[model samples]
Structure formats: C-alpha cells, structure tokens
Target: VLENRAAQGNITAPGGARRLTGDQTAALRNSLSDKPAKNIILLIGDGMGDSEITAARNYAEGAGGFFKGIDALPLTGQYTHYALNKKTGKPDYVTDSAASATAWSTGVKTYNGALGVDIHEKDHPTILEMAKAAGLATGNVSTAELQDATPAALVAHVTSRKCYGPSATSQKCPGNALEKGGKGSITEQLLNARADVTLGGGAKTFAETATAGEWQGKTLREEAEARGYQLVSDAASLNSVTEANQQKPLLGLFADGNMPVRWLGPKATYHGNIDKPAVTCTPNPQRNDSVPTLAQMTDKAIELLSKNEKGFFLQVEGASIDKQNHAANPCGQIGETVDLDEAVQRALEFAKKEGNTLVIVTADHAHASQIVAPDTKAPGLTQALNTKDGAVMVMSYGNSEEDSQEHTGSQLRIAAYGPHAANVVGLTDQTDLFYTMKAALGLK
Candidate 1:
C-alpha cells in the first residue's frame, strides 16, 4: 500500500478529484517507491577474482594489444577480502570458497569450511529463499557439483557444506532437490524444487541409484521428470524447449561433474584443432556421461526459461575459471573468461529488448591466479587457445614457471550494466552484495 501521507504532499492540488491518465497514474504511483524486481540474473565466477579477469582480458586481445569488453562496465567498489582469523594476530590473510560464498549468500562471514550456516553454524535464511517467498523465481547454476558451497548457499541450510560425498542423495534436503544434506542425502531438499530453471554441470550428484550409472547414482534428470520438469540432456533436447512448456520446470545437465573447462567448450574458436591431454580426454571417471560446452548450456537455459509470464531468474557460472587458475593454465583461464563475457554479451542484448529484466555480473570471490601477459621483446604472434578442442594444455615455457600463471589475494573486478548497476561500485564487503540485490528487488 502506498503511504499517501502529508509528508509526501497531496497527489492533486487539493481538487475534489485528481484526474490522471493511465501513464501518469502509473508513473505517479511508482515514483513514490520501488516495485519488485521481476527478474534477476546472478553470474558467479567462482574463485575468479580481479587478477584472473585481467589476465583473461589481455589474452583475448593480441600481444600488448587492447582488450575491450571486460573493461567497458562501470567499476567503483574495491572490497577488503582478508578473513577474520587472518587478522586475529594470525599469519593467514586469505579466505576459502565456502566462507567467501557464505558471505555473499547469507550476508554473514563464516569459518573456512562452512556454507549457508553462520560462522557459528546456526540456521539462517538465504537470499534465494527470501526472493522465492516474495513470489520471485530462484535458481542456482554452476559448473561444479551442485552441492558445492557457491550453489548450496542458495538453498541449503547446513553446518558443513563440504559433506557432499559418495553417500549423499538429493532427497536429503526436500525443499530444493538441488540442495544436499548433512547426513549425506539430498533427498529432503530434492523434494523442494522451487527453482523454475536450472543449468550447468554436476549431473553425477543428481543420480537416483548409486549403481544406476557410472557415477554415484544421483540423477536430477529422473527427479525433474517425476516433478514434471522438461529435462534436456543433449544438444537436440536443448533446442526443442519452448514457451508452451512454461508450466513445467526445465533441467539441462551438461556434465556429470563440472562442465569442460572454457578452452574445451563451444565458444572456443578452434573446435577440432588443439590437442587434448590423455587425462582430459578420458571419460568423466564418475558419470560416464558426455560433457557439453558452457555456451551450449547457457544458450539452452535462456531458450526455455524465457517463456514464463512472471519472468525468470537465470544464473550462469563460468565454473572452470578458478580451476584453470588452480591448474596454472593461463590460456585456459582466458578462454573461460571470454566464454563468460560472451554469455554476458548475449544477456545484455536480451535485457535491452526484454524491458523488464535486470542482469547482474560478478564473481563469488577472487582467486590467486595470475595471467602471463605477453613479453614485449622476442614475441611473435601469440596463439589464442580455442575452447572447443578441449582445454588446450599450455604450460609456462622453458624449465622455469615464472609467468602470469599465478593467483593472488588482490580484489576481483565487479561490473554491472542494467537497471540497478550503480549500486555495485567501488570497494565493498562480500555481505554487502545481499543489500545491493535486495535494493534492486525492492525488498528494503
């Protein structure tokens, strides 16, 4: 209800009745306050901080050349990222993935191993739940196992989010089949499938019978079907989903585990050119399922989720950026970032025409990875690794490993372009992300 109080002055000039046209009435009504954000897109680049993005950007451009897209967004905030114990007179100054994502999800800083639970392991409502309760659609998409901390924070209430093991079942957390449980069963949450759309890797965790497939037998595809969701497991099914199926949820699982690294995905220009390592080519040991590219999954998810009259919330993750850094693959990380940028480009264009949607882009946390920027001297044309040929294995040349192949504790870049992007500028605490989101959604 609008507070037509004297403090706000009278809507009319004290006339017997205020005459207003349809447009003026809507404008006047909305000018007083915010309306709920009809749709939200949260892009989480796990373990990808400011440093990794810079390396990725540089790699996209030619040697010593200019990188354009990554630099175009508005940059304002810089966050102080050290963990508490690190500053408790201890020698550590870094935070791990669980704690970092918890900070963003629940608006609280927890110990290194915890997830949605507070630092004390108490139950706390998450942003996803809040939005869902407010009648907004919610979903978590990631390239890692769905149980991983970044995605778990969206729906699970757990003491330790790292308990996703062989014994885990989606039935444990009945509220969201996507959520795992403390007792190692996802059953409870799997029963609560609030998310209208879900995409990205980790099909292994969704298997129903431990022996059903090569993986642990967790099958989200089966469960999604039981709940009436239209499941798309390959390129064929991905392209078939349409607006007529909006009443049904859609699930597109591309990999048994994390999807292929960016250099191996669709956006890679060299689809069949690069040589893949024996280890990289081996069938995903766990699921025996085929792995598809990130761009393919992104395209499919958007295709189906766009059908809802109530609008939709889609989350896309460049899952391997951090893993690439961990593996010390400079070219690999660049391809992944480029893939992310490509996805963002598509969404930005869609939002402009869609009118009611808002797009958000940022990383869950920064990694310690560094880019091997080209050396000014003795440098010929640098070969850009294409993501399609499987993650191109590029190591530091020579007997030494000193290159941009390192991850650091520096602040990651956070850029936004859309309705409420102005709120995400300068340095900010990870927890502050909730407020920014809430404000965008008109919650506060």
Candidate 2:
C-alpha cells in the first residue's frame, strides 16, 4: 500500500504531488556547456526504457526515492531509437541490439541483424575504430559475449549477427568469411580491431579453429595469444593487469557464454500476479564468485584506458537486462538494471572527478515489461513482487503469452553529465550519439 502520501504533502506541502523544488530554468541553462570532452564513457543498459528504470527503482528504492547514479544526471532527455527495413529503406519502427548499437557506433541506421554496415552492406567507420585511429585508448566491456551484437558492432561488420565463429561466418555470412578474402568473423574482426581493453564472455566460441587465416589450425585463444593479447579468464587474472595498451592489450573472458545474472526469481506466468505469492529476488546460486561485476569492469577499464594524455573511449554494457526481460523474468530484469546502475555510479564518479570525461547513459531499445495494476487479469504473463515500499508492484509481460517476450518500439531515456553532455538533451536520434562522441574527441 503506497498510502497515497503524495496528496498529503509528502515531497511538497498541502498537495505534495509536486516534484520540482523550483523553476529549473537556471539549472538547466548552467548544465549545457560548449567545451569538448577529452574522454567519453558511454554506459548502455540493453532494453532499458523508461518503464524498466521505474520498475527497478520502485523495487529497489521506494517511490519518491531515487538512484544515486541512474537518476543523478542533472541533465536528462529522451532519444529515439529505430531501425530501417533493408528492402524498402524505410523505418522498421523497431530495432535489435545489432542495428541500435551500430547507430550510435557508426552514426548510420542499419537494418536489424547487421553490424557496422548500412542497408547496402557497406561498412562504416565505427567510433571505436575512429578513436583508436586518433591515438586514444579504447575499451569495450559488456556482460554479454564479446561477439554478441552490441559489443561486436564496435569492431565487426557482418551482415548476419549470428556469425560469431568462423564456422557460422562461413555458413551465414559467406561474404564475410576469411576464406572469401573478407573479414573472418565477429571474433576475428574483434581481434583485429584490437581495443586496448576488451572484457566479456564467449570463451566457447574461441575453441573453434580458424579455417583460412594465417593461423589456420589454431584456436581463437591461440590466435589471441599469438597477437600479443594478455588473456585473463577470471577476476583474479583481470585484477593482476595494471597496464593495457597497444603493445599488450587485456582480454578477459569469464564465462563460456553470457555471464550469469545476479538475481533469480519466479518467471512471470499466466495469472501469476493473483495466484502466486508476492516474491523477492534471491541471489543466484549459479552466479560464480569469480566473475567480476559490471562496476568492477567499468572501474578497471577506466583505470587502464585513462593512462594516455590523449584520453580514451570506453563502452560499458549491462547486456543481461534484455536477455532476462525476453524470458519474462521480472527480478532478473530489475537485478540487471541495478547492476547497470552500479556501473553508471562508477562512470559518473570518474567523469566528475577526472574533469574532461563525458558520461552518457542510455539503452539500446525498449523491452516488454510494463507495470500494471495488481490482479488486472493480464492477457500475457504477470508477476507481483514485494517492493521496497511495502507494496505489491505488479509486472506484466504482454508481448507474447506462450513464449519469449518481444522488444517494443519506444523511445528511451538518455541521461548525461560532464563536457558536451548537453548534446543528449531534448529529443535526439540515436545516430547523433556517434557524431556527439566523434566531435567531442575531435576525431576527423
């Protein structure tokens, strides 16, 4: 029960429904600065839209209470994220991780299932490539596999998002197969892209031997070692590295596939909101202690990438939010959001103290979870959770009743701080992010 305190002078007096302290005109004006940023840290919460943020906050912190990190950015705005239909060259109205990541990474809206390429299958120079060319240290960190669409978009340009290993590349992306005289696979292109620090999972794909490269019989693990990548398999190994650069870059793979999420709970089921007891999320028994948290990865990426005078570009992603949401798991989604908030906290700390660093926090797209009245008899799946305010917050996943939920076509909340942060303010397109970071770094 929320107690309806908002109307009883809670945050305000006499009808306390108001949230603003005063006119924010002066504060908003002061936050927009013309100075360019030296370093850029972009934190992406996959499938996190306004609804996801609110649900996470409501579960973790009571309504009216806010997150120190995700909600702390004084300058906040909305950004539109959409994909194109390759055949018609018109808006598809919804996006996948591949196209959405490509939009911000290359400043072009590619069709879904493509990475770092436009509708014509032409490769565009990615922000990571551009930043590296300009002599700035770069890092790509995610809870997903390194070859997954989001992180892979920073380095690889394959027409099919499923082309992770050489075998898949040969079958699904024949033109991109190394034997065809093109880039090998997402993993191979990732190795060639050579960001100063690359941390995530996908150790399973590395076992696949290369078919046509110079190291034809060698496993990707072998190829990485041959190319001077200092491989680290766990948190212990990752912490041992204090330096990462062109000479010897850091590569951390903590899982065979995507890393395990922090929390686990009952999946939303038909009529679960009324039939099941309100539940609380529990720590996953499968989550190994050796795996590093997103915050830990973000801090380490910063420590390593910030060594250069030219500054750096780092992308940190909370990948499991989308994955869990697709399964119609409410606790799983909220836990990933909390995990992302921790990373945001770390990035904001660095940006505020380190001076010229710009921090942008946003999502790839909206997902299926929506808050609904408890016992509403939802058509799909619903679950009621015991939230922080001693109230039952009913979560409904209405995308598909029988299977995995689908992504939604909705604009996302984009928040930022530090130099050039104002570029995210108001309504903006996803492609604008690429240009914003490019101009901020002064890259041609």
Candidate 3:
C-alpha cells in the first residue's frame, strides 16, 4: 500500500489514497510512475546528429521546403553515446551502432560488436522482449538489413552482431565466444523472441530453401509461421494485408541486403512521383520496385501492432543514413534522413490522434560528416574547383574519402512527445531511454 503523503508535499499514488510504509511507498511510486503510455514508438536515425540534421535542414530549405518533421517537436534532449571496452574497464569514446544500440536496448554499455549481451557475455533482455512479456504488442522496422545491429539488438542476443544466421550447420554462433556453447544465430533468436510485427530488408538471412525445407534445417519463415507469423515479401503482398489478417503477427523481408537507396534528384527529395511532380524519381532497373519505402513499412507495422488491445512498442530505424555517411555520400545521407523524418511524422500523427502513445525520435550515434556554408565573401575558403559545368558548387571531405568517414563521439539529439516527455531532457546517457520506457510502460 502507498502512503498519502500529499499534505507533506511528497508525491502520492495515482489514486491519492492513504499513506503506506517506506518500502511500499517506493514500490508504488515506481509502479504508478509507469503505465502513463499505452503505446511507445522509438524512431532511430542511425547516424543522425546535430550537424546532420542542420545539413538536412539547409538542403531542404534550399530545395524550397523545410526541415524534417522531427524538428518541430517541442521537447528535446542531448544524449551521450559511449560504450565500455570489453577487456579494459574504460570508455571506448566512439561507439559503433551495435554497442550503442545495445546500450539503448538493455541499459548496459558493452563492446563495439556486442548486441543484446554485455561485456561479460551475459545476455540481457531487450525492451521489445519485456514489452512482449507484459502482454503488449511489439515490432521492429528498419531500412537496413533486418539482421543488422540496430534492429537485431531489439530481439536477438549475441556476443557479436555479425552472426546473423546460423553457421553452415545447426544452431551456432559462428566463430564467436558462444561457438562452443551453441547459442543460436541472431535470426533464430529473432524468430523465437516473437515480435508481433517485423519489417525490413535482408531476405537473404531469412530466405527459405525449396528442397531442404529450411535455410539450415529451420528457416525463419517456417519458424515464424509455426509461431503464428504471417509472412509478406513484396510491396503488393504487404499492401494487401487487411484488418482481419493484421490481427495475426507479420514478418516482411524486402531485399537480400539493405533496401535500395532512395532515388533523389540533384538537390535531393525523399518522396517522388512518376506522374511528373516537383520531385522526380530516378528509376533503378537493377533495384526491385516491389520494395516499399521506410514510411510505408512503418505504417504497416503500426497497423498490425495496434490490433492488440494491450497497446504496442515499435522501433523504426532509418538505417541507410549511416551506411551513406560511411561511404561519404552527402546526398544519400540527406535523402535517407528525410525519409526517416517522414516516418516520424507518421508516428507523430498517430500519437496525436491516439492520445495514449509516447513517441521518441533520436539517433544511436553521430558521423564525422559536417556542412560548411558557402560564402563568396570569405577569403581563401571560397575556392571553387572547375568542373564540366564550369565551376559548379560542391563540397569536399575533410580528409581522403577513405580516412575521414567514420563514427564520431559527439552528443546526439533526442526529442520526445506525450506522457513523461519531461523525463527526457538536458544531458542524458543512451541507457536512460531503457529505464524511461520501463516507467512509461509500467514494465517490471
């Protein structure tokens, strides 16, 4: 029982009843502080940082538009992205997406390659798993391969993020520390974790064999189906899912690897039209037209997950932003960022109408990419390189393309809306989100 210490200025339980003992009061506070949010949607722009958002905003404004919808959110915070080295008990300074994602998923810091496990190789439960156990629907959606670090960390536990599928043989962890113990692959763990809806690329990891009956004796599709999952591989099949079918769990894998890079024009646009709109789309004959956009996948996931009366937890990732940043392609990075922003807008609109959902937009880490404003008046800095178009304006990397493109140790931006939004503010650690979600969902 909780004590009604309201007269003494202490916070009371939700019911505002009588005062209880110290231990009971503490437990009551933890429990009551939660359950404020029935649905929680976490949107992660894999390599987005302050500089990347600014660059994207400037590019959008120059192209006769505005920044991504995420910029409009009222509450914001800055989070430190750092992980501890496995051997040495010190800060690694720069964290890869896998470690940083692990930090966000489990509220624990681990080495660079670690997934849902900590430095000591002990598996930690993820927010998705906890949400599922609490009788809430859960989903994971990404633009990158589904088995990639960001999405996989939500449901898969492995010492290394690379062990996506089982080895050539049965349940195995590739050549990692779990090789001897025979921990299953990330894909295997994902199927068993039972997320209500999962949409992304990387069909190669979940591909089924005609003769063998499974990818390696236990295909993800087969296992998922046996566990009540409805598989959809193409855009047509995905869009065909109805309210009746959406009551069942869903698994969608669109590409063999990461999804096709968003096709944009010179100044770049996220959404395009073949009917000849302001933003024209470039056709890639080699890429599959059947695959849907990040926004489409997000909408589908929300549709399916919301079928549950217990509410839901959904993770939407704009993954290719980091991949493009790694390749030092500003156009590609900015395009993916805008696509993610549109997806965030979808979640924001849903939360606004639902009135019971909590939405968060943030990044796992930052990239070394920066934008240098053009200034004709600035002395030596304004030199132009002659091109076929006669001195076309352009930007160059700080170092050789090979050496300069890498993840940075910079603080990232976090924006939140809905219940407990005030809990996310000022300087915060990446792990802070885990506990915050726990409180928001009343997860034990």
lDDT of 3 by residue, 26-69 (tens): 54334222238999999999989987776665454332234446
Alpha-carbon deviation at 143 in model 1, angstroms = 2.6
Task: Please provide, for model 2 over 35-64, each residue's C-alpha lDDT reduced to its tens digit, 9 standing for 90 to 100.
Answer: 878999999999999999999988997676
By TM-score, highest first, what's the ranking?
Answer: 2, 3, 1
Q: Once all C-alphas are superposed, what RMSD does model 2 give against the true structure?
A: 3.1
lDDT, candidate 1, at 245: 39
Worst 10 residues of 3 by lDDT: 267-276
Q: Count the backbone clashes (under 3 Å) in each candidate.
A: 50, 0, 5
When summed lDDT is taken over every stretch of 10 residues in candidate 2, the lowest stretch is 1-10
Q: Return the TM-score for each candidate structure.
A: 0.69, 0.96, 0.79
Clashing pairs in 2: none
Please give the lDDT score for candidate 1.
0.54
Task: Give candidate 3 regions above 4 Å deviation.
Answer: 1-35, 63-65, 168-181, 208-218, 243-247, 264-287, 375-396, 399-404
Each candidate: what lDDT? 0.54, 0.91, 0.73
**Top candidate by TM-score:** 2
Candidate 1 vs 2: which has more TM-score: 2
Q: What is the C-alpha RMSD of each candidate to the true structure, in Å?
A: 13.1, 3.1, 11.6
Candidate 2 C-alpha error for residue 312, in Å: 0.4
